[PDB]
């Protein structure tokens, strides 16, 4: 049970409490609760790649203090 940063284009930064076994679906579920962004509008980027919904976080070696990037779809 650690934390990660999620930055966006303009420079606003989202902090999340997370667990390694969290699917991507679950990370997206936490972003909406905090920031009101529908999960079907989200794209999460780590180390240049798009993260896939039913994979975990311990699949992308995502560590504490990891910084991901949100890249949003239009509704």
């Amino acid at each position: 049970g650690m934390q990660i940063f999620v930055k966006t284009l303009t420079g606003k930064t989202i902090t999340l409490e997370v667990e390694p076994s969290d699917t991507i679906e679950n990370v997206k579920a936490k972003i909406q609760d905090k920031e009101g962004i529908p999960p079907d509008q989200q794209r999460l980027i780590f180390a240049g790649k798009q993260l896939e919904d039913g994979r975990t976080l311990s699949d992308y070696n995502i560590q504490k203090e990891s910084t991901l990037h949100l890249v949003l779809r239009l509704r």
Binding site: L9, T10, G11, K12, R43, I45, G48, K49, Q50, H69, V71, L72, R73, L74, R75
Partner: protein
């Protein structure tokens, strides 16, 4: 009156027609219109189609033109259709001889941008701008040019970043997208859809800004109580790019505030 950009009207009149009642949302929006009107008294309503981003940007960029930007004055720009298409034959998948029509579109963009930048009077520039944005072939040929400009800029950045060179971060994120990993996927899955089934993602507003070399300063009204209440695209542009100011109730719709 075929205008795709409405005659300007008072911005407090607009918001008060648009937003009645005391729901949280409405009040949020009321506060945003108040913010804009501190600096801008009037608004021009921009057709709410899939070209809204591009219409609002090109109409403001062009109606405030005092000179022709060098990227457009560069005669080499006219020869760019042939150069890219000869290189990357995949570009023929463009959704509207393709050299020829894309070439007519840039040619049109330059003649019209140059016509406007030569005008003394405001009244004159605005009459001429109004008469180009009447939902006719010329208007949508201009977006075809701007969009082509966007592909070019995206191709250059993709190439710069494979060779390890300095690229604005947004272009990283632009090609990290599942369905936009390369310029081909970007054209097939994004640029082609633009003006037909969708407008510009926020990442592509960066791209639009790099393509026309204009800093885009947007009041994003639905972000009023956050730090993104004004969002600038791109976050940190060169000091010399002219500035276009837009308002937006959401990231698919954009209008023009008028005065400052």
């Amino acid at each position: 009156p075929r205008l795709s950009v409405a005659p300007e009207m008072d911005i407090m009149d607009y918001c008060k027609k648009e937003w009645r009642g005391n729901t949280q949302k409405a009040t949020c929006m009321k506060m945003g219109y108040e913010e804009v009107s501190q600096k801008f008294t009037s608004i021009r309503r921009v057709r709410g189609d899939n070209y809204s981003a591009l219409r609002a940007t090109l109409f403001q960029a062009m109606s405030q033109a005092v000179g022709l930007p060098p990227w457009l004055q560069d005669p080499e720009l006219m020869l760019l259709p042939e150069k890219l298409i000869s290189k990357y034959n995949w570009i023929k998948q463009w959704k509207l001889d393709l050299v020829d029509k894309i070439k007519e579109s840039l040619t049109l963009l330059r003649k019209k941008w140059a016509g406007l930048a030569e005008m003394r009077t405001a009244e004159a520039r605005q009459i001429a701008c109004d008469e180009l944005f009447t939902n006719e072939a010329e208007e949508y040929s201009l977006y075809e040019a701007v969009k082509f400009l966007m592909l070019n800029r995206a191709i250059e950045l993709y190439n710069d970043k494979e060779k390890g060179k300095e690229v604005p971060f947004f272009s990283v994120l632009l090609f990290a997208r599942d369905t936009s990993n390369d310029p081909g996927q970007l054209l097939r899955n994004h640029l082609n859809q633009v003006g037909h089934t969708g407008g510009l993602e926020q990442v592509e507003m960066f791209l639009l800004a790099y393509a026309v070399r204009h800093t885009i300063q947007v009041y994003r009204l639905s972000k009023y109580n956050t730090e993104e209440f004004i969002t600038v695209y791109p976050t940190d542009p060169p000091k010399d790019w002219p500035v276009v100011t837009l308002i937006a109730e959401d990231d698919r719709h954009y209008n023009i505030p008028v005065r400052v």
